[PDB]
Design a protein around this ligand. Sequence first.
Ligand code: BB2
Ligand code: BB2
Ligand code: ZN
Ligand code: ZN
Lengths: 172, 172
Amino acid sequence: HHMAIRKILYLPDERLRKIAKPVETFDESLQTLINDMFDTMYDARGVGLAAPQIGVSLRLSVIDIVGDKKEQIVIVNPEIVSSHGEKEFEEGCLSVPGAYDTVVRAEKVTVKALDRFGKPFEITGEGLLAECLQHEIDHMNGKLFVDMLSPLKRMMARRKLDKFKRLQARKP
Amino acid sequence: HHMAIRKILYLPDERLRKIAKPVETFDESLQTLINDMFDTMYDARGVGLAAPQIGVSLRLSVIDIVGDKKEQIVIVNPEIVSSHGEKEFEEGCLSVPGAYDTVVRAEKVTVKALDRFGKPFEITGEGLLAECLQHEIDHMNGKLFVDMLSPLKRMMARRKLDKFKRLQARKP
Ligand SMILES: CCCCC[C@H](CC(=O)NO)C(=O)N[C@H](C(=O)N1CCC[C@H]1CO)C(C)C
Ligand SMILES: CCCCC[C@H](CC(=O)NO)C(=O)N[C@H](C(=O)N1CCC[C@H]1CO)C(C)C
Ligand SMILES: [Zn+2]
Ligand SMILES: [Zn+2]
């Protein structure tokens, strides 16, 4: 069922910039991957995680905004079918540790996808769920939230990330 | 100048519930502690850290909302002298890993404190800075952000924290 908590990749790892490939096989190894992704997400204090963030080039993300099992969402091969409004969100990313910035995203989005067993579903989110859905799909297209920021803010995020990496190297 | 990245304590460690004592001596040992607190905060991807969170019962917090050295704030023996408004904030805490919730705090706060060398100063913050000043001072009074949540939300944060601890035990 579960195998290992996985290493999360940080910028500038090129695997975070690859366009992920659709999932086309629903077998036990996919279920093990999904289970490890949830474990990895919770262990990293996130509310979502996309497969490219652990070096797996698949259009697959796990999400839990509430933080318990009954509200777990898996989006496989998602597509945004509609979106409405614009809203500022204060956001971070497990692949850009330490960087927090305000970004503008749709206030409401509807996503069609396959669930973790390959069965079609749709979900409409607002607030954090809408933000998370857009953030995770961006990862599947090699896009990270710092990309939409000004050059100044991208530079500051780079400096913060570089300092984080230097501190991790001094951690016991 | 720097000694070691420190272990951050999680609920229910009783040291997070103690009332911190005022700082009385501004010596080199205090500077080393402050430097280590900044390192620990950045390494944990936080924008503030209070000394009780590393098991040091002192009314001392480090803050960096922006993420660079020019905006570092140190508050020593702080006192909120005024505040205005009430605003919802989405918040987490380094001492409650994995828990994110909306809390109500003042929108604007004015704090009198000593800086890292013991010089009195006053700071007025809005937005994130106001939220952070209030969050950090709460830590000095043995208060964590989950305390203001409903019993249902406190239970959900406890179980999320317990799951995080179980995953940490299974991390390589
Ligand atoms: C919020 C929805 C979009 C962000 C999703 C990310 C996780 C991620 O990188 N997926 O790619 C996350 O959990 N980020 C966290 C985050 O930004 N959070 C956590 C919940 C609320 C919000 C706080 O700004 C940080 C703290 C790691
Ligand atoms: C936000 C001001 C009050 C929170 C301060 C805490 C740090 C802390 O626990 N100090 O005691 C923090 O950085 N929390 C982070 C947090 O809530 N952040 C980071 C910046 C913005 C906001 C996102 O919700 C989480 C992600 C660890
Ligand atoms: Zn991300
Ligand atoms: Zn805290």
